[PDB]
Amino acid sequence: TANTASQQLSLDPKQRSKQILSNLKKSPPLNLNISLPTDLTSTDPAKQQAALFQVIAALQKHFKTNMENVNYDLLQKQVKYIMDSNMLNLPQFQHLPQEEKMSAILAMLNSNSDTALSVPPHDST
Known part of the structure; x- marks a missing residue:
């Protein structure tokens, strides 16, 4: 069994989030080594956000x-x-390993322009 071809669709972030994760591995090899504390994936927004700012800062x-x-x-x-x-x-995403999770989070973060900080610097002399 195999699929010949299939078009992709993404209108909202909540939806595309599922697609991006499916083709996350496609991303290039990047070793971040950023631990993912439970707070980041906590049950409440307070801890969720509080942690997010942390992981983002270090990154x-x-x-x-x-x-x-x-x-x-x-x-x-x-x-x-x-x-x-x-x-x-x-x-x-919660199913993915702490390791992969990092790649997915960062990768997705490079989806929006505002959060396009992923862009490298500009070495100049």
């Missing part, structure tokens, strides 16, 4: 520079996405 610095600051303005966007997406609560 932001490790991305731009270890001694870099924590973009709060952009954080609201990167965090908002995950919030609306509800990936943390979503079982499809």
